[PDB]
Design a protein around this nucleic acid. Structure first.
Ligand SMILES: [Mg+2]
Ligand SMILES: [Mg+2]
Ligand SMILES: [Mg+2]
Ligand SMILES: [Mg+2]
Ligand SMILES: [Mg+2]
Ligand SMILES: [Mg+2]
Ligand SMILES: [Mg+2]
Ligand SMILES: [Mg+2]
Ligand SMILES: [Mg+2]
Ligand SMILES: [Mg+2]
Ligand SMILES: [Mg+2]
Ligand SMILES: [Mg+2]
Ligand SMILES: [Mg+2]
Ligand SMILES: [Mg+2]
Ligand SMILES: [Mg+2]
Ligand SMILES: [Mg+2]
Ligand SMILES: [Mg+2]
Ligand SMILES: [Mg+2]
Ligand SMILES: [Mg+2]
Ligand SMILES: [Mg+2]
Ligand SMILES: [Zn+2]
Lengths: 94, 175, 38, 136, 58, 130, 135
RNA sequence: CGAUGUCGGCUCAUCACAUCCUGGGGCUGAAGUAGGUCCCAAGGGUAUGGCUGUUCGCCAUUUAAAGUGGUACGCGAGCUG
RNA sequence: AGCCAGGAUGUUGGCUUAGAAGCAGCCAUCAUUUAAAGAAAGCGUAAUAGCUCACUGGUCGAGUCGGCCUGCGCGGAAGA
């Protein structure tokens, strides 16, 4: 079971994306269902270690944002072309 | 570190005198004085020597462990001394001692002689063995190294001066 | 001494040691394993 | 000797080589040799690395080459002036971008795979990495 | 490799076009100054160096 | 041998000491393969393989195991006193076997305490049922 | 001390060719070993290897204790073959009986390190399997 | 390009070290003799002739060795031609 | 890590060779006393013999190990 702590993104775009990836975060977005897609930022270290297990991409994940829980499932992950880092993750609401 | 944690006990009849980083140990064999690195904090607490860092000296535990070991061997040398046993090999290789100057003959065209330093003695129980006694471990090892250097033992017959404890590899002239 | 730019352990006995700022491989067993970076 | 059997055109521009790679993920086999560095691998280097890694795996498992050199590289003979047209195609390269998976492997232990990929990478102009197939 | 030996011009007797090649394991020393380009000399007369070593071995 | 195998090992030794009444002590400071194998062979010829030469009298494994029953063995942990358990028979005759082994070419480090199973002294008890 | 078991079949007295100098590393005699071996084999059948332990002492009186005949040649007789196997898993050599393995092991049960002879019966089963005889 | 005289020889050299000899050392598939290879070292020393304009080369006979390069492929307001 | 111990039996596995006993090579590459012992990881012989390695116990008692990313840094690095 994976509970991922995330923050709602204050600002989006390429520049902000690179800024977080420098500052030890990485973006992601939850989408699906009737609620509009939620743009989140994640702590790359914890998420890296979390997805290390092959069940991470199968089970149903939960994300705590602002003290709210969201049940999702990993849709698609963006990885660095040559580094063991994550760029961005697509989550689909459970 | 781990070595510096081991406190070296002083037996009875063990005169330990501290002077900043200068430490002198006197016993029944002899007296030895060594100055320690500024980093090393040496304390004598009523029956033992203990070693620690001085703050602000980075390589403190490494220097501390070295100093601990040196003082340990100082204790050993002053109390029961150090022995180095060298053994010759080969035909005619022989050793004699004239007081404090070893007459080695090793198949050279000249007779070899080593002058000992002050703190050492030597003796030759047999023709080719030499047991040499001393206090300072570094110096006694140095003198054994010198007598061995006079003819380092070859690896083809072990021939030449070798440490008695030494085990020498022997190669074979493949044809 | 093998003067290499790429010093390694060659057996189970070879030991890497830095001396005076030079990497070396001293083999307690095999003399041919004695390497020096340079 | 990977080399196009036929090609539409016989010589090509120098071109540029910027950007990151596409064949980035270990897709066919289980283990992969991913290029950190940006360069060009002549078919010679590709074949040397392939031979080395196959010999390391003792002809067990299967080996995927995810780069095929299709760009012809031209050189003038020695001691010829600069004009007089483009030089002759002397070999073929596969432009690499950082992250291109040069090779892939399966049927071997991960340990033998790492060892074979290292014996192969020691033949390449560009610095590489060992990566594994990952679920999603 | 060195200057062309023989009889030519000052270019011939000044520029290093002869590439004389010796097969040390046998000592067969033969190579040309014929082509004005050093690599052409090297390869073209390497052909006949292989020829001379073939004759000797044979 | 992590926590799991440690738990099966402690289970095995607890079950052995609960099933058996009598035991003997040993300490192989100079215990030869001959002595160890002859004792184990004696166990095998007397009865099944249940009797062992296991050497596990640690300060934190057997001492933690003993509180179950026969708590008198907790003090025995120091000075490396290993046990050899005996399930069947009332006061089996194999106690003197370790004394004979100590007599025949041993450094006499076992001290043959006997762990006072009948609450006797540490001296040898030559009286056994016959 | 200095006990190494190196012998041949009982049929050949004075095994000078095969072992020779190995048995005579020291200046010890070669006739004493042969006479002791013959004296021991007078009570058994001839033609079988017999392992013996050797303790040479400085009083010039070597002490020797014999063992059972080797299980290799014992199973050789049991199977009735002269060549064991080469490269076994490909083509099978012969079939072996559990009861006959037990009978083979029961005679050396006395000398062996085993209470339930079934254990070393299985061990010789594995021995013949590793040689190339499937039980 | 209102001139920077090219090959080679002679005389004179000076520097580099990727050392030919001598010097110190490690491994050797180094028994010794003699080698192989690598490392430190530029203090000194480092052929004479036959042929050829030759540098080079081949050959003859020496030598501890007959080093590889820079210097306007050193040196014609120094010589030769 | 080191100090104290061991590291057995089948078996000397069958071969081809001149002999192969783990060490020349190949296939089999199991099981047995089990704390634990690979038909063998190394050194040795003419072949053994012989010294070792893996793995088990014993002593002292707080850290140990080897991967990843990275900052700075070391060698590789010889010319007039
Ligand atoms: Mg921008
Ligand atoms: Mg170099
Ligand atoms: Mg463009
Ligand atoms: Mg592209
Ligand atoms: Mg020119
Ligand atoms: Mg001009
Ligand atoms: Mg002018
Ligand atoms: Mg130099
Ligand atoms: Mg040299
Ligand atoms: Mg000079
Ligand atoms: Mg100078
Ligand atoms: Mg000078
Ligand atoms: Mg004339
Ligand atoms: Mg030039
Ligand atoms: Mg000039
Ligand atoms: Mg010059
Ligand atoms: Mg001139
Ligand atoms: Mg003229
Ligand atoms: Mg340990
Ligand atoms: Mg650098
Ligand atoms: Zn080594």
């Amino acid at each position: 079971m994976f509970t991922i702590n995330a923050e709602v993104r204050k600002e989006q775009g390429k520049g902000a994306s690179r800024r977080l990836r420098a500052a030890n975060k990485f973006p992601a977005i939850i989408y699906g269902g009737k609620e509009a897609p939620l743009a989140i930022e994640l702590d790359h270290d914890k998420v890296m270690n979390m997805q290390a297990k092959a069940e991470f991409y199968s089970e149903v994940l939960t994300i705590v944002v602002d003290g709210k829980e969201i049940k999702v499932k990993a849709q698609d992950v963006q990885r660095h072309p040559y580094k063991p880092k994550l760029q961005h993750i697509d989550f689909v609401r459970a | 570190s781990r070595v510096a944690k081991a406190p070296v006990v002083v037996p009875a009849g063990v005169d330990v005198k501290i002077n900043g980083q200068v430490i002198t140990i006197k016993g029944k064999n002899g007296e030895l004085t060594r100055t320690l690195n500024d980093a090393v904090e040496v304390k004598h607490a009523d029956n033992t020597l203990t070693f620690g860092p001085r703050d602000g000296y980075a390589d403190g535990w490494a220097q501390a462990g070295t100093a601990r070991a040196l003082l340990n061997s100082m204790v050993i040398g002053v109390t029961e001394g150090f022995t180095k046993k060298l053994q010759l090999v080969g035909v005619g290789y022989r050793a004699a001692v004239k007081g404090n100057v070893i007459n080695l003959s090793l198949g050279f065209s000249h007779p070899v002689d080593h002058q000992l330093p002050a703190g050492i003695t030597a003796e030759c129980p047999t023709q080719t063995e030499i047991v040499l006694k001393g206090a300072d471990k570094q110096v006694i090892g140095q003198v054994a190294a010198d007598l061995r250097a006079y003819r380092r033992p070859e690896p083809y017959k072990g021939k030449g001066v070798r440490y008695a404890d030494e085990v020498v590899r022997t190669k074979e002239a493949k044809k | 001494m093998k003067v290499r730019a790429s010093v390694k352990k060659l057996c189970r006995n070879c030991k890497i040691v830095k001396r005076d700022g030079v990497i070396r491989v001293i083999c307690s067993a095999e003399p041919k394993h004695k390497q020096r970076q340079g | 000797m990977l080399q196009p059997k036929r090609t539409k055109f016989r010589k090509m521009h120098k071109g540029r080589n910027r950007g990151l790679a596409q064949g980035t993920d270990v897709s066919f086999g289980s283990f992969g040799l991913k290029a950190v560095g940006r360069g060009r691998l002549t078919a010679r280097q590709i074949e040397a690395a392939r031979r080395a890694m196959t010999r390391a795996v003792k002809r067990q498992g299967k080996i995927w080459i995810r780069v095929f050199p299709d760009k012809p590289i031209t050189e003038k003979p020695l001691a010829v002036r600069m004009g007089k047209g483009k030089g002759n195609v002397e070999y073929w390269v596969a432009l690499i971008q950082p992250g291109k998976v040069l090779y892939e492997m399966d049927g071997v232990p991960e340990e033998l795979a790492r060892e074979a990929f290292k014996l192969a990478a020691a033949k390449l102009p560009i610095k590489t990495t060992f990566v594994t197939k990952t679920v999603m | 490799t060195t200057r062309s030996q023989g009889n030519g011009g000052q270019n011939v007797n000044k520029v290093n076009s002869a590439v004389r090649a010796t097969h040390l394991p046998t000592g067969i020393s033969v190579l040309a100054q014929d082509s004005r380009s050093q690599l052409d000399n090297k390869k073209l007369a390497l052909a006949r160096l292989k020829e001379k070593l073939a004759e000797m071995e044979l | 041998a992590l926590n799991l195998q440690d738990k099966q090992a402690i289970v095995a030794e607890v079950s052995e000491v609960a099933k058996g009444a009598l035991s003997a002590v040993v300490a192989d400071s100079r215990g030869v393969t001959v002595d160890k194998m002859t004792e184990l062979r004696k166990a095998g010829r007397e009865a099944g393989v249940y009797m062992r030469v296991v050497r596990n009298t640690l300060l934190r494994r057997a001492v933690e195991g003993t509180p179950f029953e026969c708590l008198k063995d907790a003090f025995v942990g120091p000075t490396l006193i290993a046990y050899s358990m005996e399930h069947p028979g009332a006061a089996a005759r194999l106690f003197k076997e370790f004394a004979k082994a100590n007599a025949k070419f041993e450094v006499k480090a076992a001290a043959f305490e006997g762990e006072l199973i009948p609450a006797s002294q540490i001296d040898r008890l030559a009286t056994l049922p016959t | 001390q200095a006990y190494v078991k190196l012998q041949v079949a009982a049929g050949m007295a004075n095994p000078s060719p095969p072992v020779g100098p190995a048995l005579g590393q020291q200046g010890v005699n070669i006739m004493e070993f042969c006479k002791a071996f013959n004296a021991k084999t007078d009570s058994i059948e001839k033609g079988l290897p017999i392992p013996v332990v050797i303790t040479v002492y400085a009083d010039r009186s070597f002490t020797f204790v014999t063992k059972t005949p080797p299980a290799a040649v014992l199973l050789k007789k049991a199977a009735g073959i002269k060549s064991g196997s080469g490269k076994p898993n490909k083509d099978k050599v012969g079939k072996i009986s559990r009861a006959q393995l037990q009978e083979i092991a029961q005679t050396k049960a006395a000398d062996m390190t085993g209470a339930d002879i079934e254990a070393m019966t299985r061990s010789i089963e594995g021995t013949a399997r590793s040689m190339g005889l499937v039980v």
